[PDB]
Design a protein around this ligand. Structure first.
Ligand SMILES: NC(=O)c1ccc[n+]([C@@H]2O[C@H](COP(=O)([O-])OP(=O)(O)OC[C@H]3O[C@@H](n4cnc5c(N)ncnc54)[C@H](O)[C@@H]3O)[C@@H](O)[C@H]2O)c1
Ligand SMILES: NC(=O)c1ccc[n+]([C@@H]2O[C@H](COP(=O)([O-])OP(=O)(O)OC[C@H]3O[C@@H](n4cnc5c(N)ncnc54)[C@H](O)[C@@H]3O)[C@@H](O)[C@H]2O)c1
Lengths: 485, 485, 485, 486
């Protein structure tokens, strides 16, 4: 379509009149997010992100809305879009455009391009607008990314400019791939150096998620990582708290809002048992489900068995499982042949990445019929067997599609890491090369201590003899770099 | 307020057009409810309930619609009303008026008087409409009650018609008591034998929850139970499953939809540790919460400590609690002095009974300012401390007000008990005196069997020598009458 | 054998020199057994049990030691025998014979006829020794019993006396039945009226375990209960604590002493999900095990599924099970054919009753080879499959045979029930008929309160208005009598 | 002032050789639970990779270790063994080891062992020296397998005092073990002036089993006093995340249950430290229904603690009403006499970490409290001024091993599998290794894991050619980046 404009701010959301509801919820998230509020007070005078022009691509939720206003509290200008077609919280997007001090007729916030229920075409357009700053002599100079979509637009964009052509999409490529090229091919017809000029301008990217960090590795190994990158995902306080315990919280929320199906007493299959696999399984156990897991990695599999779970393959467990949940971050986990053998009215969901863990393209062209129950709940029925399957969020993240994603105090951790990673890549750009980096242990321990204190946990303080005995400083770090917690 | 009437059906709901949506979730729900679906098969030809005119007072949820259409499949005529002002699922209510083979233009289901977010005046108007059948010759001849507001309206209704006067409300009476008395008083100045006529027509009551069953004990003690009552609550497959595992599910959902407070790592105070208290503590402990309990009973209290919870008074733990849940079925549990001691932005909710476990009158009278966040969530702020708390559903059942109540498969237990109870009191009425009964053990066992079979469990069968050793029939019952499971 | 006699106390134990070790652990246990130490204090001056001559059949442990010495503190005379051939803890029996003030040279305690590792013959000789008081004018006038063996001697012995003959055993009879029949026959020669005299003298029996109480229920239905009986098993503070939270303690101890098998990660099969079964499953799940349950009762079977356990048959699960535990109180659970199907080096144990849950006579006669590894551990090998299984305590109670049984504090609940039952039946004998009984709610509540105050927990006291709301006294009882906790 | 037994060419010193029939029974049973070790015997039998190895071992002398020992010898090694703790030796295990699968108490056919449960500190360091002192002066120890770094410390400190030419006088205020350690090296330096230096030349590598052992290994290295290559066995994922945590979940319960008859559920339990060993302690108690609080110095460990449902507190604020207190820090001075005086009457105190210094046993024994021994490794300590008593397990030394029998077999299958691979690699590939602390590669860590998964019956998924490609891993693994924390 065409961006909305109002009082200096271009944007495109569902409804600005939701801003008042949003503001109330933001204000409440603030009291649950000490990672960001503590970062606001510390960096208030310094203004470390001044000059920064951050293009962000992360689910547009209340929690992100508090992160965005942490970045502007520290000097930055931002533009934003979501990273899933279903995860935008519309009242959040609207509080963000309107700002703490504006009204919907006079918005005083930041540009936002997101709404719940985008098509694939609307998602890539919203993307483009987030990356395309209004003065051509001042492009995006930082990226905050989730799952690697922004970075993939710029780096593929550039790689097709440099080559003078965008390749025509093969028929058997995702329909999102067809859409992605169309955006660049149509852009290239008019502007030949657009993504090149943005790439050469961006001083670093901070990436939130495991799947995004796998893409960052494939760019650096091919030699195309065109700017420094921080792996925020693998901070101890991100991966072992947001990936695991945010999920222990929000799988349950996703499933309860989608279905009115009992968890306890049912057979649940969790695919993959990494940090997201771990949390899915612990929530289900705690609700008294009969859990089984799949894994490729014998270490991760031995962990499952020790925590009380059968390790099995999909084809062994599929036709008896009541609830099936993919959490591997890999493709082609649950296929049409598997869906076809699922019990009647079994629940299928993905909590990992994109929509390729579950074979959605195969299911659509199989001859099953779909009845939409409500947004992001669809019942599919096979005429030959008579059996039906409930599918959540069209195979895309069910905790963000069917619910609200992880609670506020969990994102306080993940986003404290994101704020810290932006400061260090902006103010210290000189010390980093075009490779993937992780934040030092002290910064990880900084963030955790904030939350330990907010919870009321009373840390023991080492004596001088005890620090000497351990080979550590009283103030930390307390552990070796390889330490696994 | 006047009832709507299409194709001979009087009703008052939120929106008929929601029926399609409702009907889709009712069909899904029938697949989750083997207990009720078994009973429709079994008694289809017998029509055991032909001639029944059942007035029901019970949360008008999707689970409850599956029940109502069970009673009608078994031959009954029913009229319905919710028993909480927040508990109606308007799409459920719509599906029920319209019936499996009707449409909103030509509905073919049953009279319903129910919408989400009724006022106290609308609530009681509804109950009267539900108890008042079209033909003054054919009143209600059966009651289905959840909490005892249908039984109270009839039994007190007749008490005041006999005294020849409905007393004034004292100025300190509970607002619902005054609203309730205003109903009986206004009916009496036009119709002086109304409640006596229905009370003498009513062949029996089947009662759903603990609180309702206590009322039934106090009417029977005072000589004032005018009809047989079955205590469905204390069916084994109801008390130990609905109250415990149902709540383990639906406590989480309520807090998740109301807030985005993380549960893991948080200090949670459960008040009361009977079966609702036992579900609440197990839901929270499985999400990582540090739980403590309050109890008056030394036995329940010793059970709590043996499952790893501190047993404390509200006085000593209120200031530290991140979430406070009241689950006692008794009043005066969390007083204004206690709300005022709560940490800034803590969560207060009740999952027990009515609205008086929490001092909601005192809170509302106190001078505290209320800001409404969204439906059933309010933030209250004290200008003396500067602290706020979040209160869910105005102090009323949080699981059915903020979310949707216990999930379907649980409610197949409760409502197969309720159907079985209505078949018994209707068809064997001669055999019952005017007092409180509980169902026979073999009936509990038959209910549970359905559910074990549906989930896929395999029950062992006793040989003739083991049945003999045990002193039991191979087909049960298997336990002494005092057995506690 | 011939009883030993020193300082006028007849006895027969393993080694009196253990008394010293015995006394320090007895004293240790007192600090852990509030219910018994409180009763000693309350009824100190009263001396309620003066005149009592208590013949007790109960596992001769440090816990029981504490009981025996409670009953003597309150006035009674006692004589004791274990109720399991392997349960005696010989240092505890030493200390009971020597008494708190005696020495091995000059004992000042009570007659004990117990050692660890008895033969069936020694077992029953010990039984008759404990029931046979020195003075023919002053027989036993009370029985404290666990499993019903002492009651069985008196009542069957009295049956053959009134009939004039003790019958022949058939070659089919179990080894212990033929030894039981042997003892009574050999006595009917020199003493025609021994047991009739004791039945008439016995004022009542108190019975500690589920299986004992079944035996009593069967004596009452056959019109043969010669004296009142108290079912201590089915006190709330016994069944719901000892049967379940004691087993959750002692099942684990028995397996760790018998073997060094990891529990975590292994498949476990628990036969029976009553109270002992519910505690077994709970132990294994908190240690990491993959637990499945077998059951005949569909209610108990559905409680299992809701706590995260498949309900399965022995036929379908026996070959996958690393540990098999029987928890039924029924005979014929694990037969020869099931043992032969067990995987190599799997552990078989029984925590229920006697030794016929496991087909131990089938095994012993099968052709299999036994290597004794150590006391109460044996490896049995099938020359035809070449597989070996480990059998704990020869199929008798694995928690008392291989370990020390339930811990001190759990037994303070069960044994304060027992002391209270003995005071009731002795000092208030007139109020009890010749049928089976359970203690009054208030007496259960008294027991729980003692142990709740000892653990640090704080009960809330009902206000006068809250007590009326509920229709209970501020001091209780607090629950209806069918109440299930 | 004590000298070895010698029979059939074996020198040794144990409790009772007549316990060998019993021990062999338990050993064969343990083999069925240890496929990590049984797998390596099969893979490497034909090749015999440890030929020429003469391994001095200092690791608790348990059934579990017995299978380790008899695995190292199936692979060609010669071994001499002693326990690393004075209370952890299982006598019947020591016997079956000396006597071998095929010998007899009169004609033993196994390996020298210097170990009995309940050694004095003089007998511990004497057994250590023997274990390290091979019969042929030409051929001393050429490999170490150590647990907590006591063997490594004798060799390196021994050496250090030979080169300064004086074993230094023990202070007035030094741990009684330190006084006993020096006294050993000073009596020997009289009659042999280059004993330890010759051994340190001959030792080609050490493999260290435990977190405290590795702390000490890190300190020698920074001193530039690490004389030989060292493999950090503790820090494999399959040792650290399965022995330290899930082993302790099992055997903490066993220690407390054998020591006392105290119910765990319902009680207030306090765990100091929340690393791998602290996390297993907590999980065990939780699952027993305990009311658990933890202490921590590290805020990351502390936040994990709270997310699993535990108050995070200090000793001083929780000590007064804990029913059970367990230290798992591997750091010193956690429970001082002041804390002990504050504990509830008949409360339990134990140590599951290291040595004897987590708990102030030196201050406790000099305080005027009186001691009554209940049974081995159970002592009741009573304070005259309060009337109060505490139960102390294992004199403040490893309770899982002192009061019970250590981790179950299937748990050690993982640690000792990591130990057997460590020894193989450091012997057959010694030239690749500098004098530094080293960890094993991920594929060896996944190979150990795969052995046990498959024993337990877990069925892993196999990646398609396209799946492995997307992840950028080979089908056969490794599956995870090197920073990955599991
Ligand atoms: N939805 C959310 O809120 C959320 C939060 C965090 C991360 N994530 C996403 O979840 C996914 C998992 O991330 P993680 O942090 O757990 O990663 P992880 O690397 O820790 O775990 C992935 C696990 O999947 C296993 N696996 C891979 N292919 C498999 C297959 N075919 N079958 C079975 N197992 C297989 C791997 O062995 C690995 O252990 C990623 O896509 C990540 O982006 C989602
Ligand atoms: N060892 C101890 O420390 C200890 C403690 C308490 C009780 N007990 C003994 O334990 C036994 C059980 O006691 P409880 O109170 O748990 O019993 P319970 O009556 O509550 O339950 C026993 C369960 O076994 C089930 N059952 C019966 N036959 C079966 C079969 N063939 N297969 C599967 N399930 C079957 C029944 O359905 C029942 O639920 C009794 O014999 C009791 O005397 C032992």
């Amino acid at each position: 379509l065409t961006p909305d404009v109002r009082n200096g701010i271009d944007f495109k959301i569902a409804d600005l009149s939701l801003a008042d509801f949003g503001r109330k919820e933001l204000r409440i998230a603030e009291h649950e997010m000490p990672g960001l509020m503590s970062l606001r007070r510390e960096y208030a005078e310094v203004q470390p992100l001044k000059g920064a022009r951050i293009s962000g691509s992360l689910h547009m939720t209340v929690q992100t809305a508090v992160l965005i206003e942490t970045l502007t509290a520290l000097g930055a200008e931002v533009r934003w879009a979501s990273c899933n077609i279903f995860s935008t919280q519309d009242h959040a997007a609207a509080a963000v455009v309107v700002g703490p001090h504006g009204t919907p007729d006079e918005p005083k916030g930041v540009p936002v391009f997101a709404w719940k229920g985008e098509t694939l075409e609307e998602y890539w357009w919203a993307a483009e607008q987030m990356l395309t700053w209004p003065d051509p002599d001042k492009p995006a100079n930082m990226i905050l990314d989730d799952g690697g979509d922004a970075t993939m637009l710029v780096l593929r964009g550039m790689q097709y400019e440099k080559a003078g052509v965008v390749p025509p999409a093969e028929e058997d490529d995702p329909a999102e791939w067809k859409v992605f090229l169309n955006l660049l091919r149509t852009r290239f017809e008019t502007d030949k150096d657009k993504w090149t000029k943005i790439a050469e301008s961006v001083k670093g990217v901070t990436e939130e998620t495991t799947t995004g960090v796998l893409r960052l590795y494939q760019f650096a190994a091919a030699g195309d990582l065109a700017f420094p990158a921080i792996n925020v995902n693998d901070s101890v306080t991100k991966s072992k708290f947001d990936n695991k315990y945010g999920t222990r919280h929000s799988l349950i929320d996703g499933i309860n809002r989608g279905t009115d199906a009992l968890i306890g007493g049912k057979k649940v299959l969790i695919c993959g048992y990494g940090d997201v696999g771990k949390g899915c399984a612990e929530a289900m156990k705690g609700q008294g489900a009969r859990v089984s897991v799949t894994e490729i990695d014998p270490i991760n599999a031995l962990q499952a068995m020790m925590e009380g779970f059968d390790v099995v393959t999909v084809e062994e467990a599929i036709g008896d499982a009541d609830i099936v949940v993919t959490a591997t971050g890999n493709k082609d986990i649950i296929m049409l042949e598997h869906i076809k053998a699922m019990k009647d009215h079994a629940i299928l969901g993905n909590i990992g990445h994109f929509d390729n863990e579950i074979d959605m393209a195969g299911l659509e062209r199989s001859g099953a019929t779909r009845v939409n129950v409500k947004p992001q709940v669809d019942l599919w029925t096979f005429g030959d067997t008579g059996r039906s399957i409930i599918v959540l969020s069209e195979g895309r993240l069910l905790n963000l599609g069917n619910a609200t994603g992880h609670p506020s105090f969990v994102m306080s951790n993940s986003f404290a890491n994101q704020t810290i990673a932006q400061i260090e890549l902006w103010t210290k750009n000189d010390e980093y090369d075009n490779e993937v980096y992780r934040l030092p242990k002290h910064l990880d321990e900084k963030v955790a201590r904030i939350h330990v204190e907010a919870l009321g946990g009373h840390l023991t303080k080492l004596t001088k003899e005890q620090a000497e005995y351990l080979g550590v400083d009283v103030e930390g770090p307390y552990k070796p770099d390889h330490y696994r917690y």
